[PDB]
Ligand binder design. Structure first.
Ligand SMILES: *[C@@H]1O[C@H](CO)[C@@H](O[C@@H]2O[C@H](CO)[C@@H](O[C@@H]3O[C@H](CO[C@H]4O[C@H](CO)[C@@H](O)[C@H](O)[C@@H]4O)[C@@H](O)[C@H](O[C@H]4O[C@H](CO)[C@@H](O)[C@H](O)[C@@H]4O)[C@@H]3O)[C@H](O)[C@H]2NC(C)=O)[C@H](O)[C@H]1NC(C)=O
Ligand SMILES: *[C@@H]1O[C@H](CO)[C@@H](O[C@@H]2O[C@H](CO)[C@@H](O[C@@H]3O[C@H](CO[C@H]4O[C@H](CO)[C@@H](O)[C@H](O)[C@@H]4O)[C@@H](O)[C@H](O[C@H]4O[C@H](CO)[C@@H](O)[C@H](O)[C@@H]4O)[C@@H]3O)[C@H](O)[C@H]2NC(C)=O)[C@H](O)[C@H]1NC(C)=O
Ligand SMILES: *[C@@H]1O[C@H](CO)[C@@H](O[C@@H]2O[C@H](CO)[C@@H](O[C@@H]3O[C@H](CO[C@H]4O[C@H](CO)[C@@H](O)[C@H](O)[C@@H]4O)[C@@H](O)[C@H](O[C@H]4O[C@H](CO)[C@@H](O)[C@H](O)[C@@H]4O)[C@@H]3O)[C@H](O)[C@H]2NC(C)=O)[C@H](O)[C@H]1NC(C)=O
Ligand SMILES: *[C@H]1O[C@H](CO)[C@@H](O[C@@H]2O[C@H](CO)[C@@H](O[C@@H]3O[C@H](CO)[C@@H](O)[C@H](O[C@H]4O[C@H](CO)[C@@H](O)[C@H](O[C@@H]5O[C@H](CO)[C@@H](O)[C@H](O)[C@@H]5O)[C@@H]4O)[C@@H]3O)[C@H](O)[C@H]2NC(C)=O)[C@H](O)[C@H]1NC(C)=O
Ligand SMILES: *[C@H]1O[C@H](CO)[C@@H](O[C@@H]2O[C@H](CO)[C@@H](O[C@@H]3O[C@H](CO)[C@@H](O)[C@H](O[C@H]4O[C@H](CO)[C@@H](O)[C@H](O[C@@H]5O[C@H](CO)[C@@H](O)[C@H](O)[C@@H]5O)[C@@H]4O)[C@@H]3O)[C@H](O)[C@H]2NC(C)=O)[C@H](O)[C@H]1NC(C)=O
Ligand SMILES: *[C@H]1O[C@H](CO)[C@@H](O[C@@H]2O[C@H](CO)[C@@H](O[C@@H]3O[C@H](CO)[C@@H](O)[C@H](O[C@H]4O[C@H](CO)[C@@H](O)[C@H](O[C@@H]5O[C@H](CO)[C@@H](O)[C@H](O)[C@@H]5O)[C@@H]4O)[C@@H]3O)[C@H](O)[C@H]2NC(C)=O)[C@H](O)[C@H]1NC(C)=O
Ligand SMILES: CC(=O)N[C@@H]1[C@@H](O)[C@H](O[C@@H]2O[C@H](CO)[C@H](O)[C@H](O[C@]3(C(=O)O)C[C@H](O)[C@@H](NC(C)=O)[C@H]([C@H](O)[C@H](O)CO)O3)[C@H]2O)[C@@H](COS(=O)(=O)O)O[C@H]1O
Ligand SMILES: CC(=O)N[C@@H]1[C@@H](O)[C@H](O[C@@H]2O[C@H](CO)[C@H](O)[C@H](O[C@]3(C(=O)O)C[C@H](O)[C@@H](NC(C)=O)[C@H]([C@H](O)[C@H](O)CO)O3)[C@H]2O)[C@@H](COS(=O)(=O)O)O[C@H]1O
Ligand SMILES: CC(=O)N[C@@H]1[C@@H](O)[C@H](O[C@@H]2O[C@H](CO)[C@H](O)[C@H](O[C@]3(C(=O)O)C[C@H](O)[C@@H](NC(C)=O)[C@H]([C@H](O)[C@H](O)CO)O3)[C@H]2O)[C@@H](COS(=O)(=O)O)O[C@H]1O
Ligand SMILES: *[C@@H]1O[C@H](CO)[C@@H](O)[C@H](O)[C@H]1NC(C)=O
Ligand SMILES: *[C@@H]1O[C@H](CO)[C@@H](O)[C@H](O)[C@H]1NC(C)=O
Ligand SMILES: *[C@@H]1O[C@H](CO)[C@@H](O)[C@H](O)[C@H]1NC(C)=O
Lengths: 319, 175, 175, 319, 175, 319
């Protein structure tokens, strides 16, 4: 003609997508992205963090030295994996505040043991049981040391062991709960035992309770387990006139980044920076709906399984 | 949108525009054509790219924590362990929901504003030599070949040059 | 408002408009009249209706929890029970305060934008045949009875038809 | 004339209202809504959830079977209501970790009891007291069974009771704390008692402490109360040679949605989905300032008592 | 900015304007001059002043709480004490980050809107007697000394008075 | 000319500053403000709140009356300050649930004591030790009262003490843990002691454990410390036939706004409304990055150390 027309516009795509705003419940935009990691990898990646499979062993049992867990001595970890099918296979026991001891050792990130030369004069050491058979032979937890009488003597034990190393020592010890009064005399000459583990700061005495419990691995007796933290320059002092299940040394506590996690998922040769009981999952998104239980560099757990963030203008097709 | 440009006075988007996000179509003495506008496109993208990083900081390592699944019934402590976790999840869930709505609302008005800005910028160049048709299209009252059009597209159009011609063409009428 | 329409170039609201939220008044050859605009009204309402539902999800059942009022002084555990609860309430209180301010800020600019959009839309129809008076009122330079006015209100006004008449009436002057 | 004027506007109302934005501390809009539920109903609605009024009874007392709480046997609930004026009226007692046991039973949502045939040979059963008089007669907690000596014999008790039912049994038992050494021999031939309730997993022994306490319902003696959870296929084993306050059976733990709540407000024939100690309150709003303590489908508790959300444009009147 | 005024059609800010935040410069028969606009300046400040107080309430006393630094390793309870605190800090940290971004985004668009509003308000006064040059400057087609300029600055300019003169000056041309 | 040009603009400054928005990572504005209080005052201001410097004393030691802490008797506080170099200098001891007792007294906000006339017939009072020498003389905690045998008699003690005052009394008492069986008889005629502190509501008995602990201030013996809250109209009843470390009266619990805080920073003559272990800090900002531990009218602790809030438009200079 003798004029000209100049039109202004913007683009559009064939594959538009719905997102929410403050103004609309649903509105089509040119493009958007998932902010919620919904899918898990199905396996726990072996690589980025140091993963340890407990297999048939719990964390607690591996550190006490239940014979069928001997493999786990020497081992450290970033993440210890506890399986459902795991079982104890040694002297039946309990731990007042089990959950806390488990938490403490999990953080330590190792069950490496450092033996110490305790002297137990008057008594006989290395008491064993049919409860944990190391091989076909009677045995006991490797990290503990069952003391019984010698001759017809169980003298008031009184042993001292200083910490000079410059870190905290964690000592694991216990007391034996026999089934009958006839047993309490038989094994330890006195009619009632006592264990007084002490330091300067703390001090804790335990009287052994006595009587029949249910059979577990042909045994109605029991063992109760306690721990003591011994600060540098302080000292451990164990006083007892019966029933002591003695320590053989110490664990080293670390201010570690280590943990434990309950899962049945298999471990595999992939790579990832975040771990749930459902398997490794991906970092790239800000949120995630796989599991509230996580370890490592993980997105934030929320209730919703999808959240779409628009990455383009409104899509306004013609037809 | 608050500017009423996208989905507004511009009736729809251009599927056949793969050059960029905003742009021009035109008819003139040399035929018809099309061209994307880079600045407006780029302005929009730079705001949308890494948008979420401005609020959520690069996600961080966390290691040992509290237990969250329990074998036995304990009462008081476990009640609290659960409540703490439950409270945290709900607070984060709210946060994510709100964050999405804000950002998305922001992304829309942003893009509508870029459209409107480009239209307004274009109009101001044309001055008295054009008419706003309502489509988002301009009736230019002079001969404006491709070099003339490019000059508008690159901000170098000089209305004084064409004023006289446009005035003849505009006021060719009057009852 | 950011658009400076409501409380701005439109000096005040119309108490005698119960038809809708936005609209027209007019004087012409057939007298004076008034009419609401449905689209703009509806646009505003659909955004405001269920506005809060887009952020806060339908509120959920919660049952047994932690104790929050204590008979005796216990120390460590109770200190923590209280701190957990105290922390949760404060975080939610912040959230509610912020949510109100955002939404309300959004509701204002939204409604100002709908006013401005309707004015701008109307202007674009009138083209060269009217003058923006500053009131939010248009001086239309031709005879425009009620059918002519309705045509503007329904988007069907054709400026070409009236151009000649408007030009006579506009340019009746010039020193 | 020969022209026409076309004016554009918006509406206004006579009854405008103030709200806050990000730009203004106060600004008048056409309309707004309360987001904070400030008002309570003044009564706890009887209907939507199953409400149970404890009246003179605490949850713990109803489940032990303090005679004046016999009415509450057989009862389950969604929400148990504990009143201030409630009182104990039976043998004086304590419960180590009372708060937890209360929490556990509240969640269970019932105090329905299932009796079991325990055999206590050697001793005499159903010991009673002037502390709880069922009628004008001496009595004891209905759910517990006080064992004392027969002839001049209190043989080392040893009873076993397996769980085959396929859910957890909750056993409630206790130990008696006599006032004098003369009493400890008189009732149970031995000079010191002992109770060892055990399973495979757990085990807990309690030595009875002895001496004068203050009088309460003409009694300076006391009773301490413990519980044991017994998983399916496990077994309960009670060993004792003095002072046992025996269980008569088990409670059934449920993974329920049930709770307990402290309130003095009356119950009434209305309907509601959310409950506070102040009474039922309304669901319709997102927040609420009535009480941090809530049960059911409740708004979120915040500090502020009003929050106005605008539901219209700015109101701009003329004058 | 969404209005494309600041950093947009107004190419830059005026360092030599200490009177206020927005304003006019002008050249005319009496020379050149400069004047701040109080209303627009004040509008902007009143929104920015005490902006944060509308969301964060006056900060409150808190006394005894939970311990947060531990001498010994305790396990379960301490794990929870730490997690509670850790969770609270992270939630507040998110909040502060988001609050800053919102407010600052709001502060920008606010100030761009005040610029645009003042330009648009000014234009509407001038009516047919001026031309939008694109700078954010107006070519006024009549003699407009300082009293004439002040009248624009104070909202009292009457375009009818100058229309005839402006028409002569505008339409002095046409090929 | 015969026209005029009228230009519109906004202002700019020489010293612009960068801030973040939702649209830009960095953008220059005319002005902005710190929202994060990064700097501490370096000292704890003496003034606005009532501050008490524990110096060589812990809160617990000041209230037990370790002689070198006599100065702190009579003292109340808003904030008690515990220093690292503090040390105990009296009979070696422990407190089951130390942390809680410390928390309880810290809230009380005072260690003011109210003596009571307990009658201990049969025994001799005010037992002392070389562990705390008040001056060069043997002594003991001022708030406690060590009972030992008289003649060759330690009769079953049974003392009663009612609360009529109309507030809770907090009683602090303990039990003695001797080093040898020879000592347990020597000091208290019986071969095993017992302490049964009771009320109507509660009741707690403690058997003294016995044996060698490490030397601390020439002593292998120990003392364990417990407390009892006694509600108005209730009554305290102490029953014992050995080892009692008796109370001399009560503390008054207050529903106070008081606390304790660990810090080594010095106190000084300035003014402030918020306190961290790093020293007083300023109120004026909403957030703060000095310390998660705070007391008083404090900003909120966050991870980030700077956050800039724009207080002006975008700065757009020319050149
Ligand atoms: C307090 O009360 C309980 C009552 O239950 C007593 O504990 C029970 O004691 C009996 C007798 O020892 C236990 O019975 C024993 O079971 C052993 C293993 O049993 C399990 O596994 C085997 C298969 O390998 C099954 O036969 C059986 O059904 C179980 O599932 C058997 O190996 C023992 O038998 C052998 O010894 C007996 C001697 O008693 C010989 O006659 C035989 O030759 C045989 O080889 C044995 O019968 C029972 O398991 C215990 N129950 C629990 C829960 O521990 C306490 O002893 C009692 N305390 C007292 C009275 O002081
Ligand atoms: C360790 O120390 C405390 C010291 O307090 C002793 O416990 C007190 O023992 C006395 C003597 O038994 C108790 O007194 C008794 O009070 C009963 C009820 O009293 C309350 O209610 C009645 C009204 O119904 C009021 O009279 C009274 O003021 C109380 O408010 C009375 O019914 C008893 O009197 C009857 O028995 C006595 C025998 O003592 C006869 O002489 C009379 O005939 C009469 O019918 C009785 O007096 C006192 O309540 C106990 N106090 C507490 C706190 O329990 C321990 O006994 C002591 N232990 C030792 C020495 O081993
Ligand atoms: C259970 O096992 C432990 C084994 O360690 C025994 O406890 C130790 O007992 C010995 C003997 O009493 C203690 O030794 C004593 O140390 C005192 C102070 O020592 C510290 O400070 C001094 C300097 O002031 C240093 O000499 C020393 O190195 C320490 O750092 C000394 O003052 C004592 O010496 C005086 O008394 C002895 C009598 O034994 C005389 O011969 C001298 O004349 C001298 O004046 C004394 O030697 C040791 O400190 C204890 N250790 C701990 C950890 O407590 C238990 O006794 C034991 N229980 C039994 C066997 O039942
Ligand atoms: C709309 O939908 C989505 C959502 O927006 C979108 O997909 C996503 O977009 C992001 C951001 O643009 C993309 O990020 C990419 O992620 C890849 C990891 O999978 C990564 O490889 C990319 O990194 C590379 O990016 C730049 C280009 O920007 C490369 O140049 C660079 O590579 C190198 O460059 C130097 C040059 O000197 C070379 O010498 C070297 O070889 C060097 O390697 C980077 O490595 C990038 O970060 C994703 O594609 C995607 N994200 C997700 C999670 O899906 C769609 O693209 C959008 N769709 C449409 C139609 O618009
Ligand atoms: C401004 O102030 C407030 C705040 O905005 C506002 O009041 C509130 O507004 C809401 C939302 O508009 C109203 O919601 C109503 O709540 C009622 C419960 O009390 C409820 O009955 C209503 O449900 C009915 O709503 C629709 C109409 O939208 C009905 O048609 C429908 O009923 C049925 O319809 C079918 C048709 O096929 C029939 O066949 C059947 O009979 C069927 O029942 C719904 O049942 C509605 O949800 C409230 O009025 C109010 N909320 C509160 C909490 O106060 C004022 O209205 C505003 N004031 C002004 C002047 O603008
Ligand atoms: C941009 O950067 C910052 C950030 O915005 C900004 O500095 C801050 O700005 C605030 C707010 O404007 C200022 O607040 C002041 O804080 C002072 C405490 O240090 C305080 O003294 C001030 O209070 C006084 O304020 C008014 C004036 O507004 C006074 O009139 C009044 O004094 C009295 O008035 C009566 C009149 O009847 C008299 O009779 C009495 O004498 C009476 O005392 C108030 O007392 C004020 O609140 C701060 O200056 C500052 N804040 C901080 C934390 O730094 C810069 O100003 C900005 N810079 C530029 C270049 O714009
Ligand atoms: C009754 C009968 O017909 N014949 C008896 C056998 O019962 C007896 O077997 C032993 O029975 C006792 C319980 O009375 C123990 O259960 C014992 O097993 C161990 C065990 O494996 O745990 C054997 C260990 O050597 C003991 N270890 C020690 C002392 O360190 C251990 C321990 O005492 C208990 O676990 C403590 O609770 O008991 C069964 O072997 C058989 C063997 O003689 S003996 O009684 O062991 O001296 O003698 C027959 O006459
Ligand atoms: C001293 C005097 O002047 N006359 C005596 C009465 O004191 C004596 O009364 C009984 O006193 C004893 C305490 O020595 C008990 O308090 C007893 O009450 C019960 C009770 O109601 O709780 C009675 C129950 O039958 C007992 N129940 C049992 C054993 O299952 C119960 C229980 O032993 C204690 O609660 C344990 O702490 O005590 C008062 O009735 C009176 C009655 O004789 S007897 O002493 O009960 O054999 O004898 C007068 O001579
Ligand atoms: C062994 C030797 O060569 N000569 C002995 C001295 O050992 C003996 O010194 C006393 O030793 C005993 C431990 O057997 C105590 O440690 C005692 O010190 C106190 C103390 O200061 O704590 C002294 C206090 O007067 C006691 N206070 C009481 C009973 O209220 C206090 C208390 O019994 C314990 O702390 C309880 O654990 O012990 C050392 O002085 C010396 C003094 O004679 S005596 O043994 O005290 O009767 O006798 C020499 O022959
Ligand atoms: C649309 O298709 C393109 C090209 O295949 C793809 O890159 C883009 O992500 C798709 N849009 C979506 C998934 O919204
Ligand atoms: C104003 O009055 C009307 C009609 O009575 C009512 O519906 C409306 O809610 C009122 N406005 C308020 C409460 O803001
Ligand atoms: C710029 O300098 C002025 C005057 O000295 C000062 O008041 C203002 O705060 C400064 N701007 C900043 C710090 O951003």
């Amino acid at each position: 003609n003798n004029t000209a027309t100049l039109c202004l516009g913007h683009h559009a795509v064939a594959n538009g997508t719905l997102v929410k705003t403050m103004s609309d419940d649903q509105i089509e935009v040119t493009n958007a992205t998932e902010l919620v990691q919904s899918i898990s990898m199905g396996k726990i990646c072996n690589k980025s963090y140091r993963i340890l499979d407990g297999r048939n062993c719990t964390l607690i049992d591996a550190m006490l030295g239940d014979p069928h867990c001997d493999a786990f001595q020497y081992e450290s970890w970033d993440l210890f994996i506890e399986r459902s099918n795991a079982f104890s296979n040694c002297y039946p026991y309990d731990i007042p505040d089990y959950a806390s001891l488990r938490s403490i050792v999990a953080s330590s990130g190792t069950v490496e043991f450092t033996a110490e030369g305790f002297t137990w004069t008057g008594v006989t050491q290395n008491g064993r049981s049919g409860a944990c058979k190391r091989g076909s032979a009677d045995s006991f937890f490797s990290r503990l040391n069952w003391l019984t009488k010698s001759g017809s003597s169980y003298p008031t034990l009184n042993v001292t062991m200083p910490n000079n190393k410059n870190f905290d020592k964690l000592y694991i010890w216990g007391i034996h709960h026999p089934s009958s009064n006839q047993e309490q005399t038989k094994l330890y000459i006195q009619e009632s035992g006592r264990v007084t583990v002490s330091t300067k700061r703390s001090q804790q005495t335990i009287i052994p309770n006595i009587g029949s419990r249910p059979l577990v691995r042909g045994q109605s007796g029991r063992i109760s387990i306690y721990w003591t933290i011994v600060k540098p320059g302080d000292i451990l002092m164990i006083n007892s006139n019966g029933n002591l299940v003695a320590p053989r040394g110490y664990f080293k506590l670390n201010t570690g980044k280590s943990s434990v996690m309950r899962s049945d998922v298999p471990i595999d040769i992939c790579v990832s920076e975040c771990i749930t009981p459902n398997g490794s999952i991906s970092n790239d998104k800000p949120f995630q709906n796989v599991n509230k239980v996580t370890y490592g560099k993980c997105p934030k757990y929320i209730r919703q399984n999808t959240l779409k963030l628009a990455t383009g203008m409104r899509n306004v097709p013609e037809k | 949108g608050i500017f009423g440009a996208i989905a507004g006075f511009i009736e729809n988007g251009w599927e056949g525009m793969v050059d960029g996000w905003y742009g021009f179509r035109y008819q003139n003495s040399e035929g018809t054509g099309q061209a994307a506008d880079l600045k407006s496109t780029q302005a929009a993208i730079d705001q949308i790219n890494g948008k979420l990083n401005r609020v959520i900081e690069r996600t961080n390592e966390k290691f040992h924590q509290i237990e969250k699944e329990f074998s036995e019934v304990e009462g008081r402590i476990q009640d609290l362990e659960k409540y703490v976790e439950d409270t945290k999840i709900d607070l984060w869930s709210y946060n994510a929901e709100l964050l999405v709505a804000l950002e998305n609302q922001h992304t829309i008005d942003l893009t509508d504003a870029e459209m409107n800005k480009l239209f307004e910028k274009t109009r101001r160049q044309l001055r008295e030599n054009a008419e706003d048709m309502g489509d988002g299209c301009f009736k230019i009252y002079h001969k404006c070949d491709n070099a003339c059009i490019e000059s508008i597209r690159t901000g170098t159009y000089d209305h004084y040059i064409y004023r006289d011609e446009a005035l003849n063409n505009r006021f060719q009428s009057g009852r």
